[PDB]
Hints:
By secondary structure, this protein is an alpha+beta fold. The chain is built from 9 helices and 7 strands.
Amino acid sequence: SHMEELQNKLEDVVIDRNLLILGRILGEGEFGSVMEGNLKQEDGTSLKVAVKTMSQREIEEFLSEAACMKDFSHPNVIRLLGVCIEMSSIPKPMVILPFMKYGDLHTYLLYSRLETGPRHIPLQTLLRFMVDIALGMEYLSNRNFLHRDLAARNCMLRDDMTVCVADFPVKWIAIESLADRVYTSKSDVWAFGVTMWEIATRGMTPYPGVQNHEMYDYLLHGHRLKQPEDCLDELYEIMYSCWRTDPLDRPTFSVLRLQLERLLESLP
Ligand SMILES: O=C(Nc1ccc(Oc2cc(NC(=O)C3CC3)ncn2)cc1)Nc1ccc(CN2CCn3ccnc3C2)c(C(F)(F)F)c1
């Protein structure tokens, strides 16, 4: 039953706090922090992890959402290893994920334009990053799950250079979502087209010369993100289809993933 499936997911997600050791702080914000850590596994050995730190009803919502995320199983979606709840002199929820030395995709693109960072990224690799994101989003959308914050800063790079969707912004929000609270999978499609543009420009902020407060009017007048300098005509047509006024006219993630795979195969 629906209840039975919920109680099952719930028992699996909690990690005993004594199996975790916390290290140094990697990042900080208003909502919480990211630290490096060690997780003791079933086989007696330890794994390097990333630990994200952040009333009974709010904690219950956190545990419920974490239980759903752990249930996801796809190579292009970040895997949730588990959760811990600490206590202050206010409850402190912690989320445990595998450590990815290359970090977020947005930072990686920027570093590639500098001499000491990763090397220049060729066209074929930029397209492969897009195919990877489309594969992760296709898995999530088929299971009726909404991301709501898709952007290059929320995509992570694995050690084998595979990209996976994760979640640690007016310029990424669909035209219908700015006019009303309305948010569907076709709104994640719009955010995906903007993400493809960030990858193709190697990390540029969307809509140069356009301020956040003048965004809704800009789109209402039919203007969209401009074609990047070295971007193929066929790739621009794919990203432009993500920004069609009527959400029903926009392609699904499954249709996008196939268009992107066919384009990559056609390259020499
Ligand atoms: O990804 C998540 N957390 C996360 C990710 C990376 C991280 O940090 C790191 C860092 C590093 N490495 C480094 O920093 C190296 C360079 C130094 N390695 C690994 N990890 C710390 C935390 N959580 C997450 C939360 C929500 C959702 C989707 N939804 C849930 C329910 N829900 C309900 C309404 N909206 C929603 C949203 C998703 C999903 F994947 F499914 F998209 C994921």
